[PDB]
Amino acid sequence: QLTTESMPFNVAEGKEVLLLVHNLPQQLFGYSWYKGERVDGNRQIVGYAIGTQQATPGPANSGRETIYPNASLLIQNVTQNDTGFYTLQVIKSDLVAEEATGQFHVY
């Protein structure tokens, strides 16, 4: 199963967290990250197109995140308010979506 996991789960204020992503399918066309536990357009952080390697910031983009070619999401300068769930959507070459949710806590 597609999974995402924070490294570290417990994150000091002002430091960084990497959302690692595991069990990707091959032949992917894009990624989309969201704040919260589901796919919710109003809370899209970033979208990525594999074909062109272009990142497009969404309405939940903070300016403090980077999505990598392997789907992982690095968040820097973390704030208390960053504590939450983060949902990844992967779009395969047949346009079928897979999703995973992960989370971290800022202290």
The structure tokens listed for 25 are 């399918």
Q: How was this structure determined?
A: X-ray
Distance CA 64, CA 51 (A): 24
> Resolution of the experimental model in angstroms, please?
1.8
Domain residue limits, the chain: 1-107
Beta partners for residue 5, in sequence order: 20
Is cis: bond before 25, omega within 30 of 0? no
Distance CA 65, CA 78 (A): 10
The structure tokens listed for 79 are 């704030």
Report the 3 state secondary structure along the chain.
Answer: CCEEEEECCEECCCCCEEEEEECCCCCEEEEEEEECCCCCHHHEEEEEECCCCEEEECCCCCCCEEECCCCCEEECCCCHHHCEEEEEEEEECCCCEEEEEEEEEEC
Beta partners for residue 67, in sequence order: 73
